[PDB]
């Protein structure tokens, strides 16, 4: 493959002025300072930038880059996007499941993975976990080779690398680049951007493209740059790295002084002549959803600490609540204790559903990378992540809480009241989680999303019906109560609990009210709070919570669909 | 000055095996990989490590390092410890106030600062802010020169530098080291540890100490290391950095192979001969407290966003609370609304006092550095930081909240009730803040401290008297209520509000109770909640809050006194 770029001008303000060159099979490095178009030209060349700002033409063997380009080319990111909770074989299996054709067999996919594992030298670690915070994993030098293997699964002809050595150590980076060079000998065009290499690295490159402030300071073979700068009016002393020498030139030991010298150079003439010589989904919805769900569930099992701890906390808390409220009485304190415990349960569901901010925020970069690369659609990824993570870990605390506290407290001893409480707790958990997703979908920092969730929950708590009586708020302000998830949860729980209860011992309030201000029955308490006594006054809350769930999960999907992937 | 170390063996497991050498006036670099004793020997040499693990002797001009050493030597940290909200002149003024003698005049201190500003080249930025998140500041290249100037205020003879160039750019680092070299010509002994320098840096060193895995691979003049390794059986090719060449040797392009060769070298013989030729508070409590308070208040004014926003939030929230609870009535809903608004106020104070985790956590490194360097005592620093930050920003929200909501809500219209509410809110804020400090004093990560604060506040809220009636809890569990700051706050607010109130219109409950279960008076509500009707039942809560404040601020001071400074 031969990737040729002609008069490329990307504008966002401009970042690339005028860049020309060609890259043939081998090791093509893009060097320069951090400001220049070192990482910009790599994305332009890799079709990982918006073509709206692009001006020139990028060509492959004479034909423009097809729409099938990014699927047939590999692109390795700078930092890691490997699942540290899978294994070196499991990551490659997930990649082969969605990047290869369904016509192939699992035996053929497994042989592809075996050949790729062998070529990289990942045999003795092929079944070890890549490593996370809680899990000890492989060294950072073989995580990079794993990330390179997730791109060679489709066996591309052009392999782009965003800074393959930044973060690695010297002895690691040298082996990584010697691996890249042995790869480039089989016939793959390797295009990367190094940050200040060492001479043991620079001695391997086959072509050098030097950029500075979006200007092309040099382009050609990487071994002739030294002579180019020696004859352009500069001298490099002994024991000085040429890659250091170039950035020392760029710093000042002028930009248009080097750009004009290169434009008047012989390399520029040969490049312009060579550039005027020539020009002159993969898979089904269900397959993608299944594999996204499988990987997200392996990741949830392989990360037991942050999933088991929520269960431990749910049990501990449920036993403490069941010890503090043990044996609810039907006396002067029964209303206060029932209302207080139900309020705590609902608001606890709401505040424990804040970890859903982490669902799409932690893996935003991997999502963007895999969506660009043609792994799956936004719909199947969204649904699989909802099905594997949000569903099973928001249902279980509600079940555990109800099963623990319902009989320690001594609530209404009916099977339907028990299950209505369980379902109501489940719905308020799902609603708070969907709101957290809608707020945090597309973002990259948890802090602001967590703060906004807490502020919204604090306000929704005031309008829930315990701290202020909702029948007493002014009309120009009362309508805000319809935006409270805790209000619907608490209203359903109170309706379910208080219906047939008496609270004045020795007095038959249900028949008649002896004295006008006693609040001796649960119906009186419910009507005094503004609650409807009919069965519709119970399920109205559940339909309002289901509508909230639908609206928030649509906002979260539209925030992922309209997110900038470039 | 001449700093000589002989047969140094620091053990924590061992980090330094056997290190010998001498450093004379000039530029002394300590190179090697990250694992070796590159940063360990620097702290051993600078008296910034515990002498419990030390074995050998470190000497200065033949006399052991006196107790007055760290005050007469400068030590510049790797990252910045300059106050980004002060100015380049203000940082040096704070340093001269506590590092120079009180005998001197302000005119003399100002001339010292002027001479230091001139020698560094900080004239045109001497009155610009160093820069923080919200504030635009000087480049990162002159923040380093500011941090170097805060150590030359006392004009030391030995200047230690922990990686003076790590984080800077190439053209910045070169100027920084050329400044250091011009300094080293006046007669100062400069001792630093570089991470993989470039040849334009290596060409300035006057002595090189190479360490690897706590072993001394080389020590002598920095220009003779090339020949040393060339004659030890290695060759360095052209255009290869010698500092890269050394770490390429250390990596493997064995540790006892280089250690034995150097032990058998001529340099080692000369060093052993030179080492067998020879051996064979500043200021008052009030001054320190005043200056700590002045700097912390300039830092609090210069950071208006995080201090003004708490006032904006206090006003907005107070106006929303005053709009929702506008016009409390003395009817069937008056008890619920009064109890709810008082509960919200107390728990809001408790949860808004979580930002006090940030007080001693954000500047832990600067505190450790300045305590080692002999700036002040733990006592004066602690008191000044409490006096400047915690005091004025925890008193003001209580005042604002009371002044806003008290007359919108229509609470008890007496001057003493108004001021008792203000004082109670103030006390609960101070108590929650002291607890947050006691929890987060000495730590370095906010996340765990914030989580623990929230968990403790959530439990204290259950025992506050609204969600569960405190007279109904079992005896083996009721004693936990005495560990609740919200309980004392809420009890004082309720005692202050409910005393002379009637809540059943048309019924003279205060005379007699017509029907046994009406709860028509505030005294009945207070006794039903377990609250004492006597004036001691009000101030008991304030003495319990004052005792809590004193205990928590003593725990926070003992956690700063017994913190490891090494």
């Amino acid at each position, epitope marked *: 493959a031969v990737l040729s770029f002609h008069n490329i001008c990307y504008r966002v303000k401009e970042i690339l002025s005028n860049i020309n060159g060609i890259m043939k099979p081998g090791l093509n490095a893009i060097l320069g300072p951090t400001g220049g178009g070192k990482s910009s030209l790599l994305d332009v060349l890799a079709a990982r930038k918006d073509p709206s700002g692009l001006s020139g033409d990028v060509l492959i063997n004479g034909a423009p880059r097809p729409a099938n380009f990014k699927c047939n080319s590999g692109y390795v990111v700078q930092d890691d996007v490997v699942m540290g909770t899978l294994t070196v074989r499991e990551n490659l299996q997930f990649s082969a499941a969605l990047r290869l054709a369904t016509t192939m067999t699992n035996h053929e996919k497994n042989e592809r993975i075996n050949r790729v594992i062998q070529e990289l030298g990942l045999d003795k670690v092929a079944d070890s976990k890549v490593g996370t915070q809680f899990i000890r994993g492989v060294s950072g030098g073989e995580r990079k080779r794993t990330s390179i293997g997730m791109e060679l699964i489709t066996d591309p002809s052009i392999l782009f690398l965003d800074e393959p050595t930044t973060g690695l150590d010297s002895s690691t980076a040298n082996a990584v680049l010697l691996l890249l060079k042995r790869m480039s000998k089989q016939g793959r065009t390797i295009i990367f951007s190094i940050h200040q290499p060492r001479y043991s690295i620079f001695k391997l490159f086959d072509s050098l493209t030097l950029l500075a402030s979006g200007r092309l300071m040099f382009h050609g073979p990487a071994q002739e740059a030294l002579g180019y700068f020696e004859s352009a009016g500069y001298h490099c002393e002994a024991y000085n790295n040429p890659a250091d020498f170039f950035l020392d030139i760029i710093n000042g030991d002028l930009i248009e002084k080097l750009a004009e010298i290169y434009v008047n150079s012989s390399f520029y003439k040969e490049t312009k002549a060579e550039l005027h010589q020539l020009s002159g989904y993969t898979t089904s919805f269900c397959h993608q959803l299944r594999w996204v769900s499988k990987r997200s569930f392996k990741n949830l099992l392989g990360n037991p600490q942050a999933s088991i701890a929520q269960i431990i906390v749910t049990v501990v808390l449920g036993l403490v609540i069941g010890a503090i409220y043990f044996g609810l009485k039907n006396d002067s304190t029964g209303i206060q204790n029932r209302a207080g415990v139900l309020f705590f349960l609902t608001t606890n569901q709401c505040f424990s559903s804040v970890s859903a901010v982490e669902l799409f925020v932690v893996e935003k970069k991997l999502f963007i990378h895999e969506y660009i690369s043609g792994y799956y659609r936004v719909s199947s990824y969204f649904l699989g992540k909802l099905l594997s993570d949000l569903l099973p870990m928001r249902m279980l605390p509600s079940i555990i809480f109800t099963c623990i506290v319902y009989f320690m407290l001594g609530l209404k001893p009916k099977a339907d009241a028990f299950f209505v409480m369980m379902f109501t707790l489940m719905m308020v958990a799902y609603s708070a989680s969907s709101m957290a997703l809608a707020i945090a979908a597309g973002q990259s920092v948890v802090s602001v999303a967590t703060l906004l969730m807490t502020i919204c929950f604090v306000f929704m708590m005031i309008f829930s019906g315990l701290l202020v009586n909702l029948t007493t708020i002014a009309s120009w302000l009362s309508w805000l109560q319809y935006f409270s998830i805790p209000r619907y949860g608490f209203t359903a729980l109170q309706h379910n609990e208080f219906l047939g209860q008496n609270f004045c*011992p020795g007095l038959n309030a249900t028949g008649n009210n002896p004295c006008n201000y006693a609040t001796c029955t649960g119906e009186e308490y419910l009507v005094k709070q503004g609650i409807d006594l009919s069965p519709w006054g119970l399920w109205k809350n559940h339909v309002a919570l289901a509508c909230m769930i639908v609206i928030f999960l649509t906002i979260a999907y539209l925030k992922l669909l309209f997110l900038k992937k470039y | 000055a001449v700093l000589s170390f002989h047969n140094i063996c620091y053990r924590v497991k061992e980090i330094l095996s056997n290190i010998n050498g001498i450093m004379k006036p000039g530029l002394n670099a300590i190179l090697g990989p990250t694992g070796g004793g590159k940063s360990s020997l620097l702290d051993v040499l600078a008296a910034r490590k515990d002498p419990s693990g030390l074995s050998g002797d470190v000497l200065i001009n033949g006399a052991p390092r006196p107790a007055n050493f760290k005050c007469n030597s400068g030590y510049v940290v790797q990252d910045d410890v300059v106050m980004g909200t002060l100015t380049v002149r203000e940082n040096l003024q704070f340093s001269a106030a506590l590092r120079l003698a009180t005998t001197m005049t302000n005119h003399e201190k100002n001339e010292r600062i002027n001479r230091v500003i001139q020698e560094l080249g900080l004239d045109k930025v001497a009155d610009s802010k160093v820069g923080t998140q919200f504030i635009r500041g000087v480049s990162g290249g002159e923040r380093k020169r500011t941090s170097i100037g805060m150590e030359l205020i006392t004009d030391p003879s030995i200047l230690f530098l922990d990686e003076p160039t790590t984080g800077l750019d190439s053209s910045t680092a070169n100027a920084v080291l050329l400044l250091l070299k011009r300094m080293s010509k006046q007669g100062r002994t400069i001792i630093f540890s570089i991470h993989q320098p470039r040849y334009s840096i290596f060409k300035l060193f006057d002595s090189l100490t190479l360490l690897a895995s706590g072993r001394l691979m080389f020590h002598g003049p920095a220009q003779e290391a090339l020949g040393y390794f060339e004659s030890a059986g290695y060759h360095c090719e052209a255009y290869n950095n010698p500092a890269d060449f050394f770490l390429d040797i250390i990596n493997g392009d064995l540790i006892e192979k280089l250690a034995e060769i150097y032990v058998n070298s001529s340099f080692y013989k000369e060093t052993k001969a030179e080492l067998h030729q020879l051996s064979g508070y500043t200021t008052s409590f009030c001054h320190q407290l005043r200056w700590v308070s002045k700097r912390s208040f300039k830092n609090l004014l210069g950071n208006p966003q995080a201090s003004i926003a708490q006032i904006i939030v206090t006003v907005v929230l107070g106006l929303v609370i005053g709009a929702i609870y506008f016009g409390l009535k003395n009817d069937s809903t008056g008890i619920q609304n009064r109890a709810g608004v008082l509960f919200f106020l107390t728990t809001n104070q408790c949860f808004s006092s979580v930002s006090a985790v940030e007080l001693f956590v954000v500047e832990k490194k600067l505190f450790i550095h300045e305590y080692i360097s002999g700036y002040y005592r733990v006592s004066s620093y602690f008191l000044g930081k409490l006096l400047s930050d915690l005091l004025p920003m925890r008193m003001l929200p209580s005042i604002i909240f009371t002044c806003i909501v008290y007359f919108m809500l229509g609470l008890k219209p007496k001057a003493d009730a108004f001021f008792v509410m203000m004082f109670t809110l103030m006390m609960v804020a101070y108590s929650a803040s002291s607890m947050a400090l006691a929890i987060a004093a000495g730590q370095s990560v906010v996340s765990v401290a914030t989580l623990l604060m929230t968990i403790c506040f959530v439990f204290m809220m259950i025992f506050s008297g609204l969600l569960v009636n405190l007279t109904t809890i079992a005896s083996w569990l009721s004693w936990l209520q005495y560990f609740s700051i919200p309980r004392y706050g809420f009890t004082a607010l309720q005692h202050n509000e409910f005393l002379g109130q009637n809540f059943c219109p048309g019924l003279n409950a205060t005379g007699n109770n017509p029907c046994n279960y009406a709860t028509c008076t505030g005294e009945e509500y207070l*006794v039903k909640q377990g609250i004492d009707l006597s004036p001691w039942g009000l101030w008991k809560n304030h003495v319990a809050l004052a005792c809590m404040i004193v205990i928590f601020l003593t725990i926070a001071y003992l956690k700063l006194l017994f913190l490891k400074k090494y």
Partner: antibody
Amino acid sequence: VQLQESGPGLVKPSQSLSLTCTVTGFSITSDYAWNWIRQFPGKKLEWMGYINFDGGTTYNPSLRGRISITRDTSKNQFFLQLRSVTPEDTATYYCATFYGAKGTLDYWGQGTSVTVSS
Amino acid sequence: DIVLTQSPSSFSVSLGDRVTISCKASGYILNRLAWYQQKPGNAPRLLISGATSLETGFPSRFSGTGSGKDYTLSISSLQTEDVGTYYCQQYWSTPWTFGGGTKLEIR
């Protein structure tokens, strides 16, 4: 409205005590709460517990697990069973009625003597 | 719980005389106080409820006055049908407790 105790006037230690109160003139399922009280020799009154008009019950905590109060609406009775009896609870036992809206014990029984001996 | 204390475990008066009985509680009762009169051989009989209200069936010689924790029962111009024992009972908290009782005598 009209209460009447009945039961054994003498009981072996550590076996049980069972009294019956039959109510005439009012329905024990209609309004009030229905209590047991005992007066010791060397007069000292002690409230034992009650059963509510809806069957709920409440006991004095100084009788831990020793007392139960049941009822039989078919003939308007409520029963006191005090198990594992000692010679200390040789009192006079009364059944009384508690209105609730008023708060006081308004109607009492005649009282029956129980002697725990051997 | 709430313990009710009557200081004069016994008294001694004559006819036409005025007598006052005191009851002291160990906690705030808020007028949830009742007075019972027991003759020898009979169950207690409710005399005062609400610490002030008098029961129908008793002369206007008994009166109740109290607040907080101190309550009193005043029998002015006592007759011979008034001799007996007098108990105070609180009905504020669920374990209802009686006072020790105060027996009246005749000189």
